[PDB]
Scaffold this motif. Structure first.
Motif, PDB file in Angstrom:
ATOM      1  N   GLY A 143       0.764  -1.249   0.000  1.00 35.56           N
ATOM      2  CA  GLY A 143       0.000   0.000   0.000  1.00 35.56           C
ATOM      3  C   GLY A 143       0.794   1.297   0.000  1.00 35.56           C
ATOM      4  N   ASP A 144       2.107   1.258  -0.233  1.00 41.69           N
ATOM      5  CA  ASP A 144       2.915   2.484  -0.140  1.00 41.69           C
ATOM      6  C   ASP A 144       2.554   3.491  -1.231  1.00 41.69           C
ATOM      7  OD1 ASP A 144       4.306   2.055   2.191  1.00 41.69           O
ATOM      8  OD2 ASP A 144       6.148   1.303   1.210  1.00 41.69           O
ATOM      9  N   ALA A 145       2.431   3.028  -2.482  1.00 46.53           N
ATOM     10  CA  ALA A 145       1.999   3.915  -3.554  1.00 46.53           C
ATOM     11  C   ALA A 145       0.610   4.490  -3.273  1.00 46.53           C
ATOM     12  CB  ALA A 145       1.996   3.158  -4.888  1.00 46.53           C
ATOM     13  N   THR A 146      -0.316   3.634  -2.838  1.00 41.11           N
ATOM     14  CA  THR A 146      -1.648   4.100  -2.470  1.00 41.11           C
ATOM     15  C   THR A 146      -1.573   5.125  -1.338  1.00 41.11           C
ATOM     16  OG1 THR A 146      -2.522   1.929  -3.104  1.00 41.11           O
ATOM     17  CG2 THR A 146      -3.945   3.326  -1.779  1.00 41.11           C
ATOM     18  N   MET A 147      -0.751   4.845  -0.316  1.00 36.78           N
ATOM     19  CA  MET A 147      -0.617   5.764   0.813  1.00 36.78           C
ATOM     20  C   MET A 147      -0.107   7.139   0.373  1.00 36.78           C
ATOM     21  SD  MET A 147       1.343   5.168   4.456  1.00 36.78           S
ATOM     22  CE  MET A 147       3.031   5.234   3.839  1.00 36.78           C
ATOM     23  N   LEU A 148       0.842   7.175  -0.572  1.00 39.33           N
ATOM     24  CA  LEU A 148       1.368   8.463  -1.030  1.00 39.33           C
ATOM     25  C   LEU A 148       0.270   9.291  -1.666  1.00 39.33           C
ATOM     26  CD1 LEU A 148       3.634  10.493  -1.619  1.00 39.33           C
ATOM     27  CD2 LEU A 148       4.218   9.216  -3.702  1.00 39.33           C
ATOM     28  N   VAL A 149      -0.581   8.675  -2.507  1.00 41.83           N
ATOM     29  CA  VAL A 149      -1.667   9.453  -3.105  1.00 41.83           C
ATOM     30  C   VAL A 149      -2.604   9.974  -2.022  1.00 41.83           C
ATOM     31  CG1 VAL A 149      -3.565   9.461  -4.757  1.00 41.83           C
ATOM     32  CG2 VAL A 149      -1.502   8.147  -5.270  1.00 41.83           C
ATOM     33  N   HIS A 150      -3.026   9.093  -1.101  1.00 41.74           N
ATOM     34  CA  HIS A 150      -4.031   9.504  -0.112  1.00 41.74           C
ATOM     35  C   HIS A 150      -3.478  10.559   0.848  1.00 41.74           C
ATOM     36  CE1 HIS A 150      -6.266   6.023  -1.612  1.00 41.74           C
ATOM     37  NE2 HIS A 150      -7.321   6.559  -1.021  1.00 41.74           N
ATOM     38  N   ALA A 151      -2.226  10.413   1.259  1.00 44.99           N
ATOM     39  CA  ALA A 151      -1.667  11.380   2.200  1.00 44.99           C
ATOM     40  C   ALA A 151      -1.455  12.724   1.517  1.00 44.99           C
ATOM     41  CB  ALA A 151      -0.353  10.859   2.782  1.00 44.99           C
ATOM     42  N   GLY A 152      -0.992  12.706   0.269  1.00 43.26           N
ATOM     43  CA  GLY A 152      -0.872  13.948  -0.470  1.00 43.26           C
ATOM     44  C   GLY A 152      -2.214  14.619  -0.683  1.00 43.26           C
ATOM     45  N   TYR A 153      -3.230  13.820  -1.026  1.00 49.42           N
ATOM     46  CA  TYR A 153      -4.579  14.339  -1.194  1.00 49.42           C
ATOM     47  C   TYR A 153      -5.045  15.017   0.082  1.00 49.42           C
ATOM     48  CZ  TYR A 153      -9.462  14.546  -2.575  1.00 49.42           C
ATOM     49  OH  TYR A 153     -10.717  14.980  -2.913  1.00 49.42           O
ATOM     50  N   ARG A 154      -4.847  14.342   1.202  1.00 49.47           N
ATOM     51  CA  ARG A 154      -5.310  14.852   2.477  1.00 49.47           C
ATOM     52  C   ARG A 154      -4.668  16.193   2.795  1.00 49.47           C
ATOM     53  NH1 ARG A 154      -3.929  11.823   8.066  1.00 49.47           N
ATOM     54  NH2 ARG A 154      -4.609  13.637   9.324  1.00 49.47           N
ATOM     55  N   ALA A 155      -3.355  16.273   2.604  1.00 45.80           N
ATOM     56  CA  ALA A 155      -2.625  17.511   2.870  1.00 45.80           C
ATOM     57  C   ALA A 155      -3.052  18.594   1.915  1.00 45.80           C
ATOM     58  CB  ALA A 155      -1.120  17.275   2.739  1.00 45.80           C
ATOM     59  N   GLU A 156      -3.187  18.227   0.633  1.00 43.52           N
ATOM     60  CA  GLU A 156      -3.587  19.160  -0.415  1.00 43.52           C
ATOM     61  C   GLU A 156      -4.936  19.791  -0.120  1.00 43.52           C
ATOM     62  OE1 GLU A 156      -2.587  18.220  -4.661  1.00 43.52           O
ATOM     63  OE2 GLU A 156      -4.783  18.084  -4.804  1.00 43.52           O
TER      64      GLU A 156
ATOM     65  N   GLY B 293      -5.918  20.648   2.717  1.00 37.47           N
ATOM     66  CA  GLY B 293      -5.705  21.622   3.777  1.00 37.47           C
ATOM     67  C   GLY B 293      -5.482  21.029   5.154  1.00 37.47           C
ATOM     68  N   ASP B 294      -5.497  19.699   5.300  1.00 34.26           N
ATOM     69  CA  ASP B 294      -5.291  19.056   6.592  1.00 34.26           C
ATOM     70  C   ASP B 294      -3.811  18.700   6.646  1.00 34.26           C
ATOM     71  OD1 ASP B 294      -5.317  17.584   8.942  1.00 34.26           O
ATOM     72  OD2 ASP B 294      -6.279  15.831   8.018  1.00 34.26           O
ATOM     73  N   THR B 295      -2.985  19.669   7.064  1.00 30.22           N
ATOM     74  CA  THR B 295      -1.539  19.548   6.934  1.00 30.22           C
ATOM     75  C   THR B 295      -0.806  19.184   8.226  1.00 30.22           C
ATOM     76  OG1 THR B 295      -1.384  21.932   7.264  1.00 30.22           O
ATOM     77  CG2 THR B 295      -1.414  21.127   4.962  1.00 30.22           C
ATOM     78  N   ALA B 296      -1.453  19.283   9.393  1.00 30.49           N
ATOM     79  CA  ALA B 296      -0.686  19.242  10.640  1.00 30.49           C
ATOM     80  C   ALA B 296      -0.029  17.885  10.857  1.00 30.49           C
ATOM     81  CB  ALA B 296      -1.578  19.610  11.834  1.00 30.49           C
TER      82      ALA B 296
END
Ligand SMILES: NC(=O)c1ccc[n+]([C@@H]2O[C@H](COP(=O)([O-])OP(=O)(O)OC[C@H]3O[C@@H](n4cnc5c(N)ncnc54)[C@H](O)[C@@H]3O)[C@@H](O)[C@H]2O)c1
Ligand SMILES: NC(=O)c1ccc[n+]([C@@H]2O[C@H](COP(=O)([O-])OP(=O)(O)OC[C@H]3O[C@@H](n4cnc5c(N)ncnc54)[C@H](O)[C@@H]3O)[C@@H](O)[C@H]2O)c1
Ligand SMILES: NC(=O)c1ccc[n+]([C@@H]2O[C@H](COP(=O)([O-])OP(=O)(O)OC[C@H]3O[C@@H](n4cnc5c(N)ncnc54)[C@H](O)[C@@H]3O)[C@@H](O)[C@H]2O)c1
Ligand SMILES: Nc1ncnc2c1ncn2[C@@H]1O[C@H](CO)[C@@H](O)[C@H]1O
Ligand SMILES: Nc1ncnc2c1ncn2[C@@H]1O[C@H](CO)[C@@H](O)[C@H]1O
Ligand code: NA
Ligand code: NA
Ligand code: NA
Lengths: 471, 468, 468, 468
Positions: free
Chosen positions: B132-145, B147-150
């Motif tokens: 799931g590392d590739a999947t995690m990168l998309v989802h975490a980037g999406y989340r930050a993008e 506005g949930d950056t903390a």
């Protein structure tokens, strides 16, 4: 120029540090050898011994070499197989100042040139002990002796590539060395200890004809060698060689093992334990019956050839797998030999076919009808050629036997209790070898009470079994 | 003239090609999938980003996907599992791949991000994932993008530090909305392994999963063969290559008796070890005891076993207190996930000595040592060659069918942003494709026999609740 | 004065009580169920008609149900499986039991009907069934009572003819509406084996199932233990007691590689036979091949194997044409169901010679012979003693919890006229009850480890689709 | 009109004959020996006195000797192992046999003496002995008859008092010189037990052996089957029939790792137990460790194991101290020497409860219990049926060949009054005769292959020192 010592041939002396790391790890796994060092250290029983060793130049053998040296021996060493050297073990021995001539992948020409180097002792003279695995060092001495006493005609009748090289070697040494050199060596050798079934057979042959030149100890038939090394060692290291060479899935495959003596029993177990369905061939009806009682189908090689995925020769005999068999095998069947030499499989008959090297000791051979076979270590010992041989712990048992045999012949023959015949070590020493290995693996041995020892007719300290006992 | 790759040595490509040829014969399911689907080109227009151990077996999967029409970029999903000749062969075939055995953690995550810079521009439109590392990168980037950056300022691991740094870098170096652009273009993900699939279900349950997913791990012909028989073959192979120890006479401890733990304990017992097992699940514990294994705690095993294997998918299984109590030169390794089943990080103030690639000796103040394999990451892939080709043929035939499902068979939106498994008819087909190579002769039901047990002659033969 | 029972030899009761006491020590799940539920009396008011092999293990089950407050009437579900000393002990304890090893099919069906004439008047209100024969009597009688009688004149076997004669005689002798009265009073049935559960799901699908049912076979702690490890222990036990043949060196053929076939093949292989397997399901066939068994058809095995075992739950597996081709004194037996896996009825005009109970030699015109065990009925129960007590403890704990569920926990009618399985929390509890006796030490998850894999510390530990 | 026999019940003959027929098919060594030597009648004129466990397997041996021409009288060598239906079948065939299961020690010794009252008058001329009792009778009576009688008074044990009184009785009731008459007529004895062969070498070394002897104990094929494979087949059989306990999940302790211990540990491990072993011999201990068994003392095992098996041939292996420490309802049994491996006599003041024949429960003052099989006698012969027919065919073929050697191949006095072994070619022939039945196809060496390994094409294939 840079090193003062260069009386050795190794692939890469810079591997010595890595070799030393793996030797230190093997020492922990070889309690019998390490205990033998402690016990015989103070007394230096091999002081004055000049041991010429011809034995796979592996990490395990390096621990044996350093045990002999710790007991006082001066040493010169070669491998007994062109693919079995572990180059970091050879580098560590060279770096310790011991002459070693051993490279993984040396040619047959080099192999025999290196064996001859055993006998030019550093500082002058000859060896006075041989430690042999397969009899090649012993055979050099006896063939050269035969030729030097005037029977030279056999050197011109070569039957194989390696015979031609070997006969060329003896010719060259009779040409270059002082006259009488082989009888000089012969007179100086106090004994030979021999490790393996084939070498031991060559010795009993010579001894029966009266041509054996010096006393011999048959180390193979110590119980703690033949019933451990030959059996459990192959059970661990056969599939290791096949995996490293081929990476095939063994579950779901059919394997054929030729031979069901000690090595064949261990080899068939190696494959069955790894997932294969194993079939066996045998000529000995007792061994065949043993295989059937263990659940293996017992068939001929003609029956097995169109069917099996994996073929292993384990016989010590010749022409087990022929070109006729290999012509009938399925595409990309795997073929390999754990027994001896390179003539259990008819490798020489394949040499007019197209060979494609896959990687070291792995070749693909193509037939005119396009089917292929995968050959491991060009038909030489697959466990030492494609992997790392037997693991250290079982070699500790073999090599404690070797060390005790070298002590027997060099130090305990002041009365010629060993004549020019083949002998085995006594059972009390066989038992002592096993005892030295029990603590490392957590065995708690029961002690006989006196009334129990008397009841079964043994001393509390052993030996526990008659000399006829088969274990 | 091709340069879009990172491998250890492109001269290894010919060696790689030869072993790929050998593996094709051992992979009848993948090869038959090329023949059946090659004419129809079902993956034409697919842009598959793969994150999966860059092995010879994966090379055969990549080239099957390409034979079906896919455009591809690939990375390994583990820093030690790449086989450098496999990677070189894939690069030499003109396929972008960024995979080196022994790459750093920083390199690992930077390579993963290169999946999404598609050659020619644009993004992938499929993900094939292992862990799931590739999947995690998309989802975490999406989340930050969004506005949930903390969460990016709160790494609990060195690799978490590297991973959040990467997300921050991509937010600055990639166009505005890049992660939303990737999310909208991914038609689906198929995920290979137990841990990755668990992370998928948990996103789906929270409503955060961005695109459809197929759980390939739970195909019968994946979980009950790869996880079981694969580890049965490749665990002891990793231990032997790393250490060359005699296994007869040794005691081994295996944490976990799920699919991998069952295959691992079998690997070691078949090789001659006496094997003990730990478990938290009373059913799995009872299975291990009925199979003849002693079932004990890690505290009980720590002072006395010679070999320790974690197979749990969980964290903090072998601790520093366990390792302080182990015998000198005990062997420790992990075949489950990540690098936190063993507390590797708790060892990094100790003296480490490298023996050889993926083998290290760790010395404690009292001078006892332990032998660590692959720095506590997957031992079968790190110290040997992973599972053999035949069992990966079953896993990767499932992966290929899952890619076809999501990219070509979702025109009616039968797959939502949820986790699905392949139907039993395809599971049975994958098995059937492997029978001829190993000489299996299947019996055919007569019609009245099929009726008597209430199945069709062509299958499915079992209820969906059957456990095999 | 109490003689409401039929047993072979009531003088066997002391011997039966001695072996029951020994079995209790080996059945910690059942004894713990007595201890927990005895004082709650959840089956007070239950009148349980049981049809299940009348063995020592079943006696511990019967006395557990009685200790929970049940009133009981019992029959065996197989004509050869009764252990006469267990039957005598149950009769001596005052429980109506009708079971003789070697009873005829006529007696077998007469005894089954005796379940339904409750002592003191009335009918049962619960059924505990193994194989579905008591359940089937009720549904056939009800069907015929509602007017549909023509099927009663169309048997296709001698046992069907006996069965249909019984239904006719009951309709003739019993008060009008008797089968509808029984059907109204049965609050539930729990069913023990694969074949019986298949019959129930069928009736549920056709809307003919008369009352709620619990499928006990598909508990994990039944199907993956009893069916598997029970047969692994008791198949070879039956063959040895029947024939005393040396098994090392023999070739054996097992038809089927589901749960019972896996255990059967393991039984023979662990005893030293070279085992071949047949299968119709490609997944199970691939499993057999990966476990090292040759997978062949019965036609290929018939001239070759020394021992044949049917394990399919299906009919017509070993035909007269197969047996004609077998070598002289090949051994033939059935561990699956009924007596139609082997075509026994086609053998009936050959020369049979009895060797000893449940062992017969059948000779063909060409003078070759075969050795038939238990006339083609369950060999482990007919020729030896069935599964050992410890694994039956898991099966029978499940059965007890199922009787509790249906009788005492259906106040809200959560169980409709459909087929249900026990929840995983109860499945886990069953396993947990068995760990102490065999010395298993379970690891406890710390809270953060539980959270990490998404479970409660107390379980359940696996998803409902987990296959173990 | 035949009355020269003593058996329990001649009516058992028909059942015995059915079982003998079934065993013949399983004893291809003996049946093929009849085929090969039958036309030549090598035992014509032989009068063989046999003393060997009177089982169905031994019946086949008796009728093989008769098929070769021999006249025969027979007794069991053990009071417990006789199968009464086997004895009856032999008496019904007109062969004098004196053997009843459970006979007294007095009867045992009187029946042994009846071997020597040959029908028609005169004496035997051959002994087939198993334990040396018949040989000891001749030699003790000879010694007494020569005037050295002092030993007949001053006995130790009750068996010795019975034996010495038997010698005194024969010296009065038989002609003067009877023992010397027997001695001069015996052309040979064959013997297969350890203690019997020890006695023969002891007498040969002392010059007191009265006739040639063949030690069949030395045979490879006799030693591996009678010791290793036979116990591997029949140990777990005896345990199951005695106790019906589940072996999967249990821990077993085997004392001894010689041939019987090797077979016993394998018997138990294959059946599912986790097996521990004790040994006094470091080579045998190391074998056990390398096969994956934990090697411990009996003191370590006593509180832990579920099942205890003595296999040492020694005494005082399991003591009262061990049994006091065992868990409640641990199982104890013996497969090694006929008695004294377990301290049975130390239990004689505890409460014994019989469960069934050869199964007893012994209760300690603290109320824990142990289950004792066959009162510490041989569990395979006592609780089940001993070794299977194919196993005994190997040992009995050896015996037949030894009787042929001494009776028919001593025209040149190549056997003097010493102890000899069968040559390896006859050991190989034994194995050869068993290959076809189990489907082995043997490879034939070409002349150059035979030369290369130093053997003749027809064998012998191994040196006399080879251990197999
Ligand atoms: N290296 C490989 O080639 C390979 C192959 C397949 C899967 N995997 C990975 O292996 C791991 C396990 O996978 P699986 O399919 O066997 O999962 P699984 O759920 O079937 O089994 C895991 C087992 O771990 C047990 N467990 C959890 N925490 C424990 C603890 N603290 N102590 C003891 N036991 C504990 C569970 O009860 C469970 O039975 C996963 O991370 C998976 O992704 C690796
Ligand atoms: N004797 C016992 O103690 C015991 C214990 C448990 C179950 N059973 C009975 O055993 C039978 C099998 O049970 P199961 O749980 O293993 O069921 P299962 O569904 O798990 O397995 C049966 C297998 O038979 C296979 N099969 C069907 N027809 C076949 C054919 N013509 N040839 C080859 N294979 C065929 C199926 O493909 C299947 O894999 C049932 O009748 C069950 O009730 C008996
Ligand atoms: N039950 C049968 O059917 C059957 C068959 C053959 C032999 N036997 C008998 O079994 C006995 C053993 O036979 P074997 O062939 O295995 O002999 P063996 O000599 O090969 O083995 C005996 C082993 O017991 C070990 N030992 C001795 N005293 C011990 C002690 N106090 N603790 C632990 N180990 C000890 C010895 O080291 C030896 O390895 C003999 O009495 C033999 O006659 C029984
Ligand atoms: N790792 C090893 N090191 C040295 N010798 C070995 C090793 N493995 C096997 N051998 C020896 O090689 C011989 C075969 O030539 C065997 O007798 C065995 O003892
Ligand atoms: N000893 C036994 N006692 C009672 N039932 C048994 C026994 N052995 C097997 N069974 C049951 O018999 C069923 C087959 O009818 C199996 O499902 C199994 O649970
Ligand atoms: Na090695
Ligand atoms: Na691989
Ligand atoms: Na039972």
């Amino acid at each position: 120029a840079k090193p003062g010592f260069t009386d050795y041939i190794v692939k890469d002396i810079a591997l010595a540090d890595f070799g030393r790391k793996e030797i230190s790890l093997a020492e922990t796994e070889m309690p019998g050898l390490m205990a033998t060092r402690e016990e015989y250290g103070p007394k230096q029983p091999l002081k004055g011994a000049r041991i010429a060793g011809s034995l796979h130049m592996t990490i395990q053998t390096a621990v044996l070499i350093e045990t002999l040296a710790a007991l006082g021996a001066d040493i010169r060493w070669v491998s007994c197989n062109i693919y079995s050297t572990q180059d970091h073990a050879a580098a560590a021995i060279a770096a310790a100042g011991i002459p070693v001539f051993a490279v993984k992948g040396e040619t047959l020409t080099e192999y025999w040139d290196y064996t001859a180097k055993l006998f030019d002792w550093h500082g002058g003279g000859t060896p006075n002990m041989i430690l042999d695995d397969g009899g090649d060092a012993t055979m050099l001495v006896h063939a050269g002796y035969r030729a030097e006493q005037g029977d030279t005609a056999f050197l011109d009748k070569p039957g194989s590539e390696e015979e031609e090289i070997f006969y060329a070697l003896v010719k060259r040494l009779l040409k270059e060395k002082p006259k009488g050199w082989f009888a000089e060596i012969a007179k100086n050798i106090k004994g030979v200890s021999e490790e393996t079934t084939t070498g031991v057979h060559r010795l009993y042959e010579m001894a029966n004809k009266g041509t054996l030149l010096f006393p011999a100890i048959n180390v193979n038939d110590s119980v703690t060698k033949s019933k451990f090394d030959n059996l459990y060692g192959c059970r661990e290291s056969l599939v290791d060689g096949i995996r490293r060479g081929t990476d095939v899935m063994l579950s779901g495959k059919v394997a054929m093992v030729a031979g069901f003596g000690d090595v064949g029993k261990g080899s068939a177990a190696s494959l069955r334990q790894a997932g294969c369905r194993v079939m066996v061939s045998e000529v000995d009806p007792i061994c065949a019956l043993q295989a059937a009682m263990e659940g293996y189908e017992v068939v001929t090689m003609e029956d097995a050839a169109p069917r099996a995925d994996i073929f292993v020769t384990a016989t010590g005999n010749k022409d087990i797998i022929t070109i006729e068999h290999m012509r009938a095998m399925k595409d990309r069947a795997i073929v390999c030999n754990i027994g001896h030499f390179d003539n259990e499989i008819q490798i020489a008959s394949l040499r007019n076919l197209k060979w494609t090297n896959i990687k070291p000791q792995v070749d693909e051979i193509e037939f005119p009808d396009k089917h292929r076979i995968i050959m491991l270590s060009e038909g030489r010992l697959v466990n030492l050629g494609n992997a790392m041989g037997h693991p250290s712990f079982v070699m500790s048992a073999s090599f404690t036997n070797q060390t005790l045999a070298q002590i027997e012949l060099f130090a305990n023959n002041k009365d010629s209790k060993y004549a020019k015949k083949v002998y085995v070590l006594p059972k009390t020493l066989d038992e002592k070898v096993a005892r030295l290995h029990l603590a490392k693996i957590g065995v708690k041995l029961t002690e006989l009470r006196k009334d129990q020892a008397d009841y079964i007719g043994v001393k509390q300290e052993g030996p526990y079994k008659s000399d006829h006992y088969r274990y």
